[PDB]
């Protein structure tokens, strides 16, 4: 239950697999359950900025999107709910995330490298 | 070498010792060595929002502020220089501190609870 994957596009590109790059659009949000689709305060988004790019399942980035990511394909919209554990723990990222939040991301895979 | 301090002024109020609680004032910026002192873009600080309160020593910040933190006086403004190792590491956060992110903070220590 540290990631749970909710697919609202299905895609029919490959899967990602360990260490290949991976090109994404995403918006994060604190879990809140008394918010319309758990969505609290969004907190960081990759639109208006630019596509975010990284190596996947080589930790660097939170274990919910590594685990996440993995288990979709190239085209496919999902939405991530990572528990605390599998996000920023009880570090969380200070300015952005509290301590022991839960996260929502919406994610779009558009490409791997 | 993971964290070095410049002391720019000196506090004269009590240092923390591991496991107490400090109130900082913080500004953060990822090291770049082609810029005056060495500090590239700002991520993030608390400058007109409010202060950071944490337990300190117990790793509930990065190793660097754990550190950097515990050495200092209330009253005391420092610049820590934080190696990647002492920084937010391997994850970053995306779209403000890629992986493997050396820092430098401007750090301001108020009060020790």
């Known amino acids: 239950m540290g990631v749970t994957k909710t697919t609202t596009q299905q895609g029919t590109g490959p899967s990602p697999q360990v260490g290949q790059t991976v090109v994404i659009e995403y918006t994060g949000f604190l879990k809140d359950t008394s918010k319309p689709d758990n969505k609290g305060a969004q907190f960081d988004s990759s639109v208006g900025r630019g596509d975010f ?32 554990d599998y996000g920023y723990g009880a570090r969380g990222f200070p300015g952005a995330i509290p301590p022991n939040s839960d996260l929502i991301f919406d994610v779009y895979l558009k490409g791997i490298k």
Chains 1, 2 share one sequence.
Do not use: N, P
């Open 53 to 84: 790019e990284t190596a996947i399942g080589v930790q660097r980035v939170i274990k919910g999107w590594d685990e996440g990511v993995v288990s979709m394909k190239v085209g496919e919209k999902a939405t991530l709910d990572i528990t605390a």
